Design a protein around this ligand. Structure first.
Ligand SMILES: [Zn+2]
Lengths: 381, 128
């Protein structure tokens, strides 16, 4: 993909591929609340990194128009305000307030850098994507069981991670404090680059942590012991040794000198820890420190946060921010995600059904199913 | 008024407390015994320092998680389907919040209905 080719393709996509009808269905939420779509904030990033916010639109036609006119490189969705953002200058000071917004989570592979060995920075590979695969299951289950949020849209971020939009009416009316509470409840791996032991579970395992460890276990052997090989050599297993009390460290080292496979080393570590009881949760702390999602509480706490819009185009990879089907999560491949160049090649190879002829169709289908569920909830209620 | 209310709440036995919470449609739980057995292990691991038999001797309440922020935030109460299961100090705070809201509204309305009372000389020397 040639990023110099981005300015050539962006218009066509925004003209014949961007799913505006479903997009308006989403952000309009069945028209129940008046001025809901009209008070939504958008922000655009144009060529040469020119940023504009407090953009609002009257209806789908105005949005389609101004978007096709601007051809933005980035589209971010923001809060629904007390008035129309376009007229925020006209609103008396203090009377312009963000009132409702989806509850959103951003999980970014870059935040896992201190604990992955295959890639670094913005590089991803099939060996590390399983971490995202774990996160979506660990988090989404909580959101479906502990909090009872029923309408959850998971979206690929385009490069390094995934976003989650929780769109239940209750989740859209949550205050800042309630959002911060939700984020802290879901958050376990606490600390920066200056801390080595980032998980310190108490004697009692809270049911949520038990279910997160249960989800982790299913994948741990493949991710950590086979793929990541977190015990390949001394430079790496020294870390895991650094994560357990010194008392057994020596006892482990000799054992790790006689083990040929990291699965064997894990068995040995588990046996040694079991023999050594307050430390019976130490293996769980290691698993969490290598597998549990990291959440930027600043992303989810603030109501006025602008997050990458679904079906955006990644300025560098060119991939489309496509929704991820929860059931088919295990089959999701971030490298097969349609790029803008591929879908423009597909478009120029054959009115409201043009996208069905591209590789974008199944993802718009997943989005349509999610919107159908939202409509059913709006009606039934 | 808030102070007085707090004191009185502080003097309420758990039974009486629940009665109050019901009569005003505050609906802070009360879980059934069958549901309690259904989530026995989860409840046991949720409440800190709760023994098996002692837990069998206790009854929880179901509250929307938006009211248990201070409990949920450090993960000291189980959440299931948007409701926290809170055992039998902080609750008074929530009750008081509700009370205060209501009372403020009421005072506003009363200040709006003042002209009707000023004409009653009998009650003017007192109230004014
Ligand atoms: Zn990798």
């Amino acid at each position: 993909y040639d990023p110099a080719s981005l300015p050539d393709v962006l218009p066509l996509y925004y003209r014949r591929l961007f799913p505006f009808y479903q997009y308006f269905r989403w952000l309009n939420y069945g028209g129940v609340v008046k001025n809901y779509f009209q008070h939504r904030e958008f922000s655009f990033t144009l060529k040469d990194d020119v940023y504009v916010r407090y953009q609002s639109f009257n209806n789908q036609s105005e949005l389609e128009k101004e978007m096709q006119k601007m051809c933005p490189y980035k589209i971010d969705i923001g809060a629904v305000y007390s008035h129309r953002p376009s007229l925020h200058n006209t609103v008396k000071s203090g009377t312009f307030q963000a009132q409702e917004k989806e509850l959103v989570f951003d999980i970014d592979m870059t935040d896992y850098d201190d604990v992955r060995r295959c890639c670094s920075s913005a590089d991803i590979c099939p060996k590390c994507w399983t971490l995202m695969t774990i996160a979506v299951r660990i988090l989404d289950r909580a959101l479906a069981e502990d909090f009872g949020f029923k309408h959850r849209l998971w979206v690929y971020s385009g490069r390094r991670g995934v976003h989650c939009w929780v769109c239940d009416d209750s989740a859209r009316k949550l205050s800042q404090a309630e959002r911060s509470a939700v984020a802290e409840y879901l958050s376990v791996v606490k600390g920066g680059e200056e801390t080595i032991k980032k998980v310190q579970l108490p004697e009692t395992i809270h049911p949520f942590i038990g279910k997160s460890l249960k989800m982790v276990e299913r994948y741990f052997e493949k991710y950590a012991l086979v793929d990541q090989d977190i015990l390949e050599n001394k430079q790496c297993w020294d870390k895991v040794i650094a994560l357990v009390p010194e008392v057994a460290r020596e006892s482990l080292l000799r054992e790790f000198s006689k083990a040929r496979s990291s699965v064997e080393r894990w068995d040995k570590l588990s046996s040694c820890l079991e023999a050594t009881r307050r430390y019976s949760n130490i293996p769980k702390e290691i698993m969490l420190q290598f597998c549990y999602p990291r959440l930027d509480v600043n992303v989810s706490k603030g109501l006025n946060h602008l997050l990458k819009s679904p079906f955006s185009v990644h300025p560098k990879t060119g991939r489309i921010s496509v929704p991820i089907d929860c059931k088919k999560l295990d089959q999701f491949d971030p490298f097969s995600v349609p790029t803008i160049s591929l879908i423009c090649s597909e478009l120029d190879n054959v009115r409201t059904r043009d996208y069905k002829r591209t590789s974008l169709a199944p993802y718009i289908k997943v989005f349509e199913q999610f919107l159908d569920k939202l409509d059913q909830s709006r009606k039934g209620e | 008024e808030m102070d007085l209310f707090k004191f009185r709440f502080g003097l309420l036995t758990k039974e009486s407390v629940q009665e109050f919470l019901k009569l005003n449609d505050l609906q802070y739980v009360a879980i059934s015994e069958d549901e309690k057995n259904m989530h026995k292990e989860d409840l046991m691991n949720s409440s800190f320092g709760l023994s098996l038999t002692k837990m069998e001797d206790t009854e929880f309440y179901k509250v929307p998680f938006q009211a248990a922020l201070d409990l949920v935030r450090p993960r000291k109460v189980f959440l299931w389907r948007g409701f926290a299961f809170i055992p039998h100090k902080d609750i008074v705070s929530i009750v008081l919040n509700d009370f205060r809201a209501k009372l403020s509204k009421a005072l506003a309305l009363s200040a709006r209905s003042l002209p009707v009372v000023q004409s009653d000389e009998r009650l003017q020397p007192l109230l004014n």
